[PDB]
PDB file of C-alpha atoms in Angstrom:
ATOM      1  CA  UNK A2197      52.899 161.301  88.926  1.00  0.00           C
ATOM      2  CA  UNK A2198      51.465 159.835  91.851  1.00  0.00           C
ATOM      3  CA  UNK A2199      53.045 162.822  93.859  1.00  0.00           C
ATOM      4  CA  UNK A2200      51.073 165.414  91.670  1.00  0.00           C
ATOM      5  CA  UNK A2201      48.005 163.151  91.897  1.00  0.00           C
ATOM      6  CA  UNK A2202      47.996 163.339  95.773  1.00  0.00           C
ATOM      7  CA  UNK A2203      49.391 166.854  95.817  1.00  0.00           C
ATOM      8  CA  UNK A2204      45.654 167.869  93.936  1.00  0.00           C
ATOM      9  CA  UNK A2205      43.770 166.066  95.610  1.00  0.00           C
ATOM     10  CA  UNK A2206      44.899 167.710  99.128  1.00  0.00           C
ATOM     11  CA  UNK A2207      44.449 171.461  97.422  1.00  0.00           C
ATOM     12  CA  UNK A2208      40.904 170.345  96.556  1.00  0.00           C
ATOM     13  CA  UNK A2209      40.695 169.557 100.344  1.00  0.00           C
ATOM     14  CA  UNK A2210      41.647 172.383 101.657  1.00  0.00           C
ATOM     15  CA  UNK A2211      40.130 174.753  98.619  1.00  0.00           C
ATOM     16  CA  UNK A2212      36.773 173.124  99.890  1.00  0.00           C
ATOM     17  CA  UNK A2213      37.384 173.958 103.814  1.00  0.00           C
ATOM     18  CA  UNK A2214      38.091 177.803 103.121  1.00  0.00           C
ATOM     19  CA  UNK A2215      35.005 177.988 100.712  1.00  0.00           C
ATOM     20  CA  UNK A2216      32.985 176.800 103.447  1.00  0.00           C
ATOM     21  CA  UNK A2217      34.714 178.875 106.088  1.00  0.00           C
ATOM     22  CA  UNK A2218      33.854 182.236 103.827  1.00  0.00           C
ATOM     23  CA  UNK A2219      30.315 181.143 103.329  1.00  0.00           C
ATOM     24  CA  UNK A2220      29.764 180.592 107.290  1.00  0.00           C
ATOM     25  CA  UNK A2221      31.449 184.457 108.103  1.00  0.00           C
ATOM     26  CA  UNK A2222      28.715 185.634 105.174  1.00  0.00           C
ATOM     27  CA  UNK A2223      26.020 183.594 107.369  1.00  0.00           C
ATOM     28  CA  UNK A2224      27.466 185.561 110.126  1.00  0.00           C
ATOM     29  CA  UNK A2225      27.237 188.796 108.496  1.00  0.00           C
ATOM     30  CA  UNK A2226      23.499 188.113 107.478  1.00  0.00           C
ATOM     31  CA  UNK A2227      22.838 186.683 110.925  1.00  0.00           C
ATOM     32  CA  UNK A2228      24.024 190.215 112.443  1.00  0.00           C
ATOM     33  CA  UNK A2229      21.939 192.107 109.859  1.00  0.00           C
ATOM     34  CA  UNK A2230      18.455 190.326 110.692  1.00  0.00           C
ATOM     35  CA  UNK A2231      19.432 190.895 114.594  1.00  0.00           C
ATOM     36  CA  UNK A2232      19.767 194.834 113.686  1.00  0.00           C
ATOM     37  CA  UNK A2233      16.167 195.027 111.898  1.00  0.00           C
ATOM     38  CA  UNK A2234      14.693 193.586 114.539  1.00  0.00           C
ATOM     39  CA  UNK A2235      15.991 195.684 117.015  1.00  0.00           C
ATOM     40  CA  UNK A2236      15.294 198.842 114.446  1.00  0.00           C
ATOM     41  CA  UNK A2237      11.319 197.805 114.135  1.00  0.00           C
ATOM     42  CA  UNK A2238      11.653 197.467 118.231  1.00  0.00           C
ATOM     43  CA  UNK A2239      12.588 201.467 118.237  1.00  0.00           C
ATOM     44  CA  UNK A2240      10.159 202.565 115.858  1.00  0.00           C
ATOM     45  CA  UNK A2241       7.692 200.459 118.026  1.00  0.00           C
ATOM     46  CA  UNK A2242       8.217 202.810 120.506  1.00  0.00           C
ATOM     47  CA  UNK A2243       7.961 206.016 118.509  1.00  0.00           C
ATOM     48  CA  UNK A2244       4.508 204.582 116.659  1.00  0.00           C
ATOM     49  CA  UNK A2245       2.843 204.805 120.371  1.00  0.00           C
TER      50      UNK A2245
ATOM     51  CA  UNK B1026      61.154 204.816 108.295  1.00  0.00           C
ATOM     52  CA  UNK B1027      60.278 204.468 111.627  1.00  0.00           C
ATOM     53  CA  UNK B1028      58.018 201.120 111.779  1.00  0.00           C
ATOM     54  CA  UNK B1029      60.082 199.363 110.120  1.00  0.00           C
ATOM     55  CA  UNK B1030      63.003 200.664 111.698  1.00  0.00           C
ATOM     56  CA  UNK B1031      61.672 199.464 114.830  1.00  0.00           C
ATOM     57  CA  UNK B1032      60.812 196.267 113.661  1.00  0.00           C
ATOM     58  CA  UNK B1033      63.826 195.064 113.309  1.00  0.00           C
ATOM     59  CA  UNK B1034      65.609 196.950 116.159  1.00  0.00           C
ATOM     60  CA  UNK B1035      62.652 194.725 118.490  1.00  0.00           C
ATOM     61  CA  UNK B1036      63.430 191.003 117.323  1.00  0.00           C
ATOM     62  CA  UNK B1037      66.349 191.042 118.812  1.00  0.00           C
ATOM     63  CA  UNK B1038      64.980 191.682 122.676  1.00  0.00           C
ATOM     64  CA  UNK B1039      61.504 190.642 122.216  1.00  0.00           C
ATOM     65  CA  UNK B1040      61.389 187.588 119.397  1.00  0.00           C
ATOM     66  CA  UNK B1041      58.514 186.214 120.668  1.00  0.00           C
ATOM     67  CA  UNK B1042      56.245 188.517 119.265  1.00  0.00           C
ATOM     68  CA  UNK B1043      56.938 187.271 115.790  1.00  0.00           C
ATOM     69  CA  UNK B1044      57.324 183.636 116.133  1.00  0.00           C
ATOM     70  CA  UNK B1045      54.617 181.730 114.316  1.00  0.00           C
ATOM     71  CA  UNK B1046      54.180 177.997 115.008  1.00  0.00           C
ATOM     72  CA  UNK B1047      52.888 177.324 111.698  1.00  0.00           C
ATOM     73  CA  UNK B1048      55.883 178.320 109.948  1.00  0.00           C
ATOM     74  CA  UNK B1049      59.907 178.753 110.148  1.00  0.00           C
ATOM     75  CA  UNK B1050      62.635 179.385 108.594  1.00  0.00           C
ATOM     76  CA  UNK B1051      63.921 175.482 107.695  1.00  0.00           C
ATOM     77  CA  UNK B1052      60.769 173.547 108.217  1.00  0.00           C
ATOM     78  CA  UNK B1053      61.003 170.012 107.114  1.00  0.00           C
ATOM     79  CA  UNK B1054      59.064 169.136 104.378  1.00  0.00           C
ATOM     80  CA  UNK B1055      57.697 166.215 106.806  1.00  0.00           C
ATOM     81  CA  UNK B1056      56.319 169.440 108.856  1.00  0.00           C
ATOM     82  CA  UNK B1057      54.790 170.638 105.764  1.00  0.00           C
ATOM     83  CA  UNK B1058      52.822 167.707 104.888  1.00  0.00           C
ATOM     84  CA  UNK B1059      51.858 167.545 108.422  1.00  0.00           C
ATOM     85  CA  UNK B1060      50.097 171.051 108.340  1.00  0.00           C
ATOM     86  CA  UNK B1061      48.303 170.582 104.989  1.00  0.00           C
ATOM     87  CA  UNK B1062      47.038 167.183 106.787  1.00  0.00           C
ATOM     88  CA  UNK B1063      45.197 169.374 109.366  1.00  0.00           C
ATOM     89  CA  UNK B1064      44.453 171.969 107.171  1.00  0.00           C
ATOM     90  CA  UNK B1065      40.877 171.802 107.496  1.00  0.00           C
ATOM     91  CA  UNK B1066      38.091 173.314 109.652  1.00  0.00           C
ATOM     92  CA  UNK B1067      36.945 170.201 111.152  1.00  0.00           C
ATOM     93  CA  UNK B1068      39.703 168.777 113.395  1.00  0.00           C
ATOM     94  CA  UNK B1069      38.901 165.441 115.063  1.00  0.00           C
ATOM     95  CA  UNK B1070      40.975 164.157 117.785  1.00  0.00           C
ATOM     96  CA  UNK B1071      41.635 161.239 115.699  1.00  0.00           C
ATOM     97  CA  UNK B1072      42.191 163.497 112.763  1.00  0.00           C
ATOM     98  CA  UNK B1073      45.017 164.868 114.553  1.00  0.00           C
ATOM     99  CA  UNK B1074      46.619 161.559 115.612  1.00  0.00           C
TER     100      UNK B1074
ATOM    101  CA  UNK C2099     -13.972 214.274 116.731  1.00  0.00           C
ATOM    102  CA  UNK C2100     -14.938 211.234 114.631  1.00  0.00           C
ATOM    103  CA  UNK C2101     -12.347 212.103 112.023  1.00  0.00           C
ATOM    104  CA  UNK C2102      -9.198 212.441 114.531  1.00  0.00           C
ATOM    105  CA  UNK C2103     -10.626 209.108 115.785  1.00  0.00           C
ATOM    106  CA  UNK C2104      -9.538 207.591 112.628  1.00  0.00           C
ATOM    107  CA  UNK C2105      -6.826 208.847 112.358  1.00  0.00           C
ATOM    108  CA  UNK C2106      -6.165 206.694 115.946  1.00  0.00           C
ATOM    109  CA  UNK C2107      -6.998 203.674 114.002  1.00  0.00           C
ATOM    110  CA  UNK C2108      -4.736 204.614 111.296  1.00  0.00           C
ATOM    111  CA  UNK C2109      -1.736 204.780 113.065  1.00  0.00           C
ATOM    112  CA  UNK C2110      -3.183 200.971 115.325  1.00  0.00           C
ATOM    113  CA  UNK C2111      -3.206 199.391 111.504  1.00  0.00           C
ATOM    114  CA  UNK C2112       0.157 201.063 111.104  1.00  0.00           C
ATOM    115  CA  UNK C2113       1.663 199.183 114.221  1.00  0.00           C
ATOM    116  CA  UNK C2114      -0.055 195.978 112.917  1.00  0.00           C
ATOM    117  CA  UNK C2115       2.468 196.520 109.957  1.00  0.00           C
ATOM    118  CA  UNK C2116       5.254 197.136 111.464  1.00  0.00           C
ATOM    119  CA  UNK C2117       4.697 193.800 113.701  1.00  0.00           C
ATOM    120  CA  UNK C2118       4.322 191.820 110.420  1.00  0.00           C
ATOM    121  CA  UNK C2119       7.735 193.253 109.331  1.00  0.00           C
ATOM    122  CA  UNK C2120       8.984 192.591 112.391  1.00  0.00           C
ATOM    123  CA  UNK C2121       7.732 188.830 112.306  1.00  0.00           C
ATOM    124  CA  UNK C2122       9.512 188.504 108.890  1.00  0.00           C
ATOM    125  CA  UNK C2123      12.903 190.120 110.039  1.00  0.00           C
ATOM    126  CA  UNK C2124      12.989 187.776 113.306  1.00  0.00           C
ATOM    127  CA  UNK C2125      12.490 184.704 110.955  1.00  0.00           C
ATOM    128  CA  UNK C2126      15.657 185.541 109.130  1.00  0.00           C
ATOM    129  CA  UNK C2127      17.621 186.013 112.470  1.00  0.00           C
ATOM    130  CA  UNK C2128      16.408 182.654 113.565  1.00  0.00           C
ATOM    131  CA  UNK C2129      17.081 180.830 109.987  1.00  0.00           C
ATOM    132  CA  UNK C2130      20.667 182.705 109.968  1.00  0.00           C
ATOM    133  CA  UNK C2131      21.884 181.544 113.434  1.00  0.00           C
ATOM    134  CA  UNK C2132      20.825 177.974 112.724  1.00  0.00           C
ATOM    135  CA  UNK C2133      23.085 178.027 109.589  1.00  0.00           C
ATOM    136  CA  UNK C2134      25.752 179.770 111.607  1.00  0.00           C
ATOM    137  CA  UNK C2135      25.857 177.233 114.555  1.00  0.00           C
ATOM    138  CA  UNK C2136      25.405 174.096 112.292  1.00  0.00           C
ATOM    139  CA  UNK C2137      28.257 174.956 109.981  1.00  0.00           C
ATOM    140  CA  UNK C2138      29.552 172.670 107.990  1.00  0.00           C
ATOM    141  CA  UNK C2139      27.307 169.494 108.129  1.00  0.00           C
ATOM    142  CA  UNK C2140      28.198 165.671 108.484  1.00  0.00           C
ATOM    143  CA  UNK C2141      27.430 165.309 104.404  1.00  0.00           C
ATOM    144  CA  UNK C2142      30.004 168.221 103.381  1.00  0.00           C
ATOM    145  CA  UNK C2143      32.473 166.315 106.482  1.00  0.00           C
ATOM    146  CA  UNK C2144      32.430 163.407 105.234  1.00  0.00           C
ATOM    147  CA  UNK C2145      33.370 164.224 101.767  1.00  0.00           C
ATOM    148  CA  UNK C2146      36.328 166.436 102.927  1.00  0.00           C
ATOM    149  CA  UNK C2147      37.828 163.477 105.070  1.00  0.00           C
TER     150      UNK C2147
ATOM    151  CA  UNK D2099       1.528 222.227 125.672  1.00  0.00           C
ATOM    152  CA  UNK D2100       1.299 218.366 126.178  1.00  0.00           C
ATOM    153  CA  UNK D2101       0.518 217.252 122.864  1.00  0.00           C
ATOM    154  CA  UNK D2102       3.184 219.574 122.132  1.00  0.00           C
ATOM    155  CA  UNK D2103       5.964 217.867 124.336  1.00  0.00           C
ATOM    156  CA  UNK D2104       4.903 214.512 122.631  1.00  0.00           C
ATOM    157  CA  UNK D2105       5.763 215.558 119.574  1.00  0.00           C
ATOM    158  CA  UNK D2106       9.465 216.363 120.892  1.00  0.00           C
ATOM    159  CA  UNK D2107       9.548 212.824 122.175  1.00  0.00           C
ATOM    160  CA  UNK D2108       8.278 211.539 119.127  1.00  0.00           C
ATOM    161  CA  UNK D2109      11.469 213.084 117.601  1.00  0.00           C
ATOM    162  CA  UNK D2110      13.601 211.235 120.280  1.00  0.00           C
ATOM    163  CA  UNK D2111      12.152 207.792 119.636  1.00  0.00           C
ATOM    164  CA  UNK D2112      13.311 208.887 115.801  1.00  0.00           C
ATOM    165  CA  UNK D2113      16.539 210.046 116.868  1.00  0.00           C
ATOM    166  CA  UNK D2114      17.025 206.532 119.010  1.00  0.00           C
ATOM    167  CA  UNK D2115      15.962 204.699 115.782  1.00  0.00           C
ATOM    168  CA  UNK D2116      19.023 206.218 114.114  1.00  0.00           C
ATOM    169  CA  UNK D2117      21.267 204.799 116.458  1.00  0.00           C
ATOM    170  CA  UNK D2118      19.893 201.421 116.171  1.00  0.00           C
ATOM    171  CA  UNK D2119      20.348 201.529 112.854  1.00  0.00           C
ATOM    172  CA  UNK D2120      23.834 202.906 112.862  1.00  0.00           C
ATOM    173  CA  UNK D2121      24.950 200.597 115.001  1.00  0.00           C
ATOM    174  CA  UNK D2122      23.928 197.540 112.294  1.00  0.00           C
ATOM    175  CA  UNK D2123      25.826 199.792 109.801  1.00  0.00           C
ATOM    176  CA  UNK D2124      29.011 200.177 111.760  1.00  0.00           C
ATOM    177  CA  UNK D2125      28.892 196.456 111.887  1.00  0.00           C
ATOM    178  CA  UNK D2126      28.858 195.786 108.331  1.00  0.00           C
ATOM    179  CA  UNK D2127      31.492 197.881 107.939  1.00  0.00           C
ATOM    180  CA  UNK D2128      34.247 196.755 110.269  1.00  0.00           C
ATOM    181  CA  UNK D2129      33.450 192.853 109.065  1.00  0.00           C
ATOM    182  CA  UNK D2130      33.986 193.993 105.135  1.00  0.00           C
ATOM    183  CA  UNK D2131      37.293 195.572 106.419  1.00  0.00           C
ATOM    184  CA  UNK D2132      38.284 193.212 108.472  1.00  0.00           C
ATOM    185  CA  UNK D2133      37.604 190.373 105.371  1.00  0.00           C
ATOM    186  CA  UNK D2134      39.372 192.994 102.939  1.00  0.00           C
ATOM    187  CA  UNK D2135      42.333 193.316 104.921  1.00  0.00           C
ATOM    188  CA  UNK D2136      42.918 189.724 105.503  1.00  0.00           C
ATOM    189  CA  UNK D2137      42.244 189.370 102.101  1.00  0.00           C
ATOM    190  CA  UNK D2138      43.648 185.624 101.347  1.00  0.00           C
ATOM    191  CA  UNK D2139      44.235 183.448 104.583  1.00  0.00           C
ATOM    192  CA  UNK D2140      46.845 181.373 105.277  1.00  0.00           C
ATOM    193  CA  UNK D2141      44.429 178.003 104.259  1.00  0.00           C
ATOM    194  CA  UNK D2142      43.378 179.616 100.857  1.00  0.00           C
ATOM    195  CA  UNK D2143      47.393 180.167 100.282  1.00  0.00           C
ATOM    196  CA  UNK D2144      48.424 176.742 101.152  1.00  0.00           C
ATOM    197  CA  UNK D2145      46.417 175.475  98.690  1.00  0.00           C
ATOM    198  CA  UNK D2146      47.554 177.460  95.313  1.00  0.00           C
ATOM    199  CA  UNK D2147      51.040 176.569  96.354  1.00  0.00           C
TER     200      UNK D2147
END
């Protein structure tokens, strides 16, 4: 019993790590989205004058 | 077919390119629990010893 | 000649729009990175270890 | 002839906005196939088991 105890406890553990690990690569993905549109509205700068 | 063909045909001269230190056939279960103990994202010197 | 001179101002008040947009989009680049470089914080740590 | 000629670069700056954006696009896709293809990681699988 004590071995399933511990055994669920670790899973939560690690569950917890990976869930954070795939919300930082979607950071990462929005991150890299907001550098494109500011880079975009820098080129149409360019063909507004 | 032929990637897998040449898969197998490879391990025997060039191993190396398959060997994974994370797992092997016959790990010890005491290897096991050491890898879900560092499991997470943030690994602390101290965590590790 | 003072019609196609508004027209000049038109396309001045369009640039000021674009610059707004453009003030918007670099806030969410500079929000995202933060979040991306901080990661996982010493709350979420803690509770992990 | 040279309000003319602006009007072909004003086509180029479009053009060169295109790219920009493209290249923000590309992006997105190679990180949503790179995420599909690795699909669960090796953390996420050490947990279930």
């Amino acid at each position: 019993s004590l071995s399933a105890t511990a055994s669920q406890y670790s899973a939560d553990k690690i569950s917890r790590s990976e869930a954070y690990r795939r919300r930082r690569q979607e950071w990462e993905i929005q991150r890299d989205n907001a550098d494109g549109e500011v880079k975009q509205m820098d080129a149409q700068l360019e063909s507004l004058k | 077919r032929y990637s897998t063909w040449g898969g197998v045909s490879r391990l025997v001269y060039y191993p190396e390119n398959y060997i994974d230190p994370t797992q092997r056939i016959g790990q010890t279960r005491m290897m096991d629990e050491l890898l879900e103990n560092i499991s997470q994202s943030k690994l602390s010197r101290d965590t590790v010893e | 000649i003072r019609i196609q001179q508004r027209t000049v101002d038109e396309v001045d008040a369009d640039i000021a729009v674009l610059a707004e947009s453009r003030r918007s989009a670099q806030n969410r680049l500079e929000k995202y990175q933060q979040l991306y470089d901080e990661d996982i914080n010493h709350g979420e740590q803690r509770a992990m270890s």
